[PDB]
Design an enzyme around this catalytic site. Structure first.
Site, PDB file in Angstrom:
ATOM      1  CB  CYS A   1      27.529 -24.649 -13.011  1.00 55.34           C
ATOM      2  SG  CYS A   1      27.983 -23.153 -12.250  1.00 55.34           S
TER       3      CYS A   1
ATOM      4  CG  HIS B   1      33.446 -23.099 -14.496  1.00 54.18           C
ATOM      5  ND1 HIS B   1      32.570 -23.939 -15.182  1.00 54.18           N
ATOM      6  CD2 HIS B   1      32.796 -22.699 -13.377  1.00 54.18           C
ATOM      7  CE1 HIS B   1      31.428 -23.996 -14.526  1.00 54.18           C
ATOM      8  NE2 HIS B   1      31.545 -23.301 -13.394  1.00 54.18           N
ATOM      9  CD  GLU B   2      34.719 -21.859 -10.015  1.00 51.97           C
ATOM     10  OE1 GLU B   2      34.032 -20.971  -9.445  1.00 51.97           O
ATOM     11  OE2 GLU B   2      34.367 -23.001 -10.359  1.00 51.97           O
TER      12      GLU B   2
ATOM     13  CG  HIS C   1      30.953 -18.339 -11.748  1.00 53.43           C
ATOM     14  ND1 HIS C   1      29.651 -18.455 -12.230  1.00 53.43           N
ATOM     15  CD2 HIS C   1      31.387 -19.612 -11.497  1.00 53.43           C
ATOM     16  CE1 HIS C   1      29.359 -19.742 -12.326  1.00 53.43           C
ATOM     17  NE2 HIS C   1      30.360 -20.458 -11.853  1.00 53.43           N
TER      18      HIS C   1
HETATM   19 MG    MG Z   1      29.983 -22.722 -11.965  1.00 56.48          MG
END
Ligand code: MG
Length: 183
Positions: free
Chosen positions: A111, A154-155, A158
């Site tokens: 990341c 993953h996005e 966030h």
């Molecule tokens: Mg990330």
């Protein structure tokens, strides 16, 4: 131009908030932000630009990572030889359905907000369906599998204040789950 100085780092409280839903239509400023996020990724993947501006290469970026607590993401995955490539700017993305079967990258994940590598597998769903809006407020529904499913999870994580390393098994960090797909 966004550069590494715009990316907040692990420990910044914005990375652990729940990002706010966007109202449609987007403002001109919100459009510009999302376009700039994508443009960061484009830059990050161009070898000469990335070297000139000191960029780490990325395939996804979520608004909280530039300290904007709003539910917008950009994903830019170049063709890996299949002819499949992914270039999406999404607003209010939601996973509406997914496989039971898991998938993981065999070296873990990284990341741009996390300066040091963290070892361990990050098990995600192998297949997902996303409903989102595009930058003009039109409707997108994506069916994803394997590496692009991972990236989008993953996005979206966030947006909920979740980081990749939250998923790592502290006892057996490198042990694959039974029947999980190695991507
Ligand atoms: Mg990330």
């Amino acid at each position: 131009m966004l550069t590494m100085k715009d990316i907040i780092r692990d420990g910044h409280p914005t990375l652990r908030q729940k990002a706010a839903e966007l109202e449609l239509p987007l403002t001109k400023e919100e459009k510009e932000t999302l376009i700039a996020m994508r443009e960061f990724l484009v830059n990050s993947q161009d070898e000469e630009i990335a070297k000139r501006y000191g960029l780490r290469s990325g395939v996804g970026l979520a608004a909280p990572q530039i300290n904007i607590s709003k539910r917008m993401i950009a994903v830019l995955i170049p063709d890996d030889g299949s002819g499949k490539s992914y270039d999406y700017m999404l607003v209010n993305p939601k996973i509406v359905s997914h496989s039971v079967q898991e998938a993981y990258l065999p070296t873990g994940e990284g990341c741009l907000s996390v300066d040091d590598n963290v070892a361990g597998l990050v098990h995600r769903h192998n297949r997902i369906t996303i409903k989102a809006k595009d930058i003009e407020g039109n409707d997108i529904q994506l069916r994803l599998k394997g590496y692009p499913a991972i990236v989008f999870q993953h996005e979206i994580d966030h947006l909920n204040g979740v980081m990749f390393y939250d998923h790592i098994d502290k006892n057996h960090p490198l042990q694959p789950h039974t029947d999980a797909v190695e991507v």
